[PDB]
Amino acid sequence: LTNIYLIGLMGAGKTSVGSQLAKLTKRILYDSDKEIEKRTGADIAWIFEMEGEAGFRRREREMIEALCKLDNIILATGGGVVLDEKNRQQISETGVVIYLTASIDTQLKRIGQKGEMRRPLFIKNNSKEKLQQLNEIRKPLYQAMADLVYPTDDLNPRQLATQILVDIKQ
Amino acid sequence: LTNIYLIGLMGAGKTSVGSQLAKLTKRILYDSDKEIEKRTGADIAWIFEMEGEAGFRRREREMIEALCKLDNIILATGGGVVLDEKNRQQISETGVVIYLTASIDTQLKRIGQKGEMRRPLFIKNNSKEKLQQLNEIRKPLYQAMADLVYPTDDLNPRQLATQILVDIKQ
After folding, report:
1. Cα(A80)–Cα(A142) distance, rounded to whole angstroms?
2. What is the Cα A150 distance to its own chain's centre?
3. Hey, what domains does chain B have and what are their CATH numbers?
4. Given an 8 Å threshold on Cβ–Cβ distance, is A115 in contact with B43?
5. Where is Mg(2+) annotated to bind (chains A, B)?
6. How many secondary structure helices (H) and strands (E) does chain B include?
7. What φ, ψ does residue A79 adopt, rounded to 5°?
8. Taking Cα atoms as reference points, which of B57, B33, B38, B49 lies closest to residue A17?
9. Could you say which residues from 61 to 90 on chain A have a Cβ atom under 8 Å away from some Cβ of chain B?
10. Contacting residues of A for B15, CB less than 8 Å apart
């Protein structure tokens, strides 16, 4: 155990809540996406282009295997990680599982906001529908693995993260 | 000196090329955005919401100051970092400056591709125009600071990163 796993779709607040927890605890925060890019030595866009989604899922499972071995870490889990039974196995076995929820509107804010640009980017309605369809069919699975569940709309990082830390223990 | 600074707009390949360089050199790759979120203990979306762009630029400059002190690192620099004279000062003084270029089409690929989703997200034409306007007015500034310049379309990470390492020295 000892690991904290944060799960949910893109824009669920994994990075946000994940950053606050790592502050309050001096633990190292990992992001499975960034870890994959690091080991690959290329960005996610290169992976999908040269190897397709399948190529990414492969690399994703290798990294999850490796990360789950580490102890006392915190992990912002790529939304697609729980699609694989093996990943769900290692995760449920090696740490607590927190499912973070957010409205479609909260999602689009986080996803769209870039540092170099004042207003967030907006996605096409086509893409938005795709996202809401994902929300639809991945939610139940997330709920399954969820030891604990929290909304992250109107988020007060510090408040929620300490609250989360209390709900851990037990 | 000793630092490698990667600059450009979102989707310029900073993370990609940055990951390949860190592999080939066993150096630590930093991303000013992630560093900011880490110290803040919240995501960029929270910063812009509770403090606006101004609040972000403040935090951005503190982190750039701190990172520039570090030695022999690699840094994927947030697109907005070079807007501040002080940042441009510390950067040009403490390392090499690589400007990475990419077509609008290459940009939209990298920006839109999420790990958990097969096809990339597409942004609205409104947002795309905003991006091309940024490209327009930030390019010259990037070119100014650029010690070295590379395109990243049809990127062969390994090939370009070694090529970059050769062009360093001198």
Report:
1. 11
2. 13
3. 1-170 (3.40.50.300)
4. no
5. 15
6. 7, 5
7. -50, -30
8. B38
9. 78-81
10. 37, 43
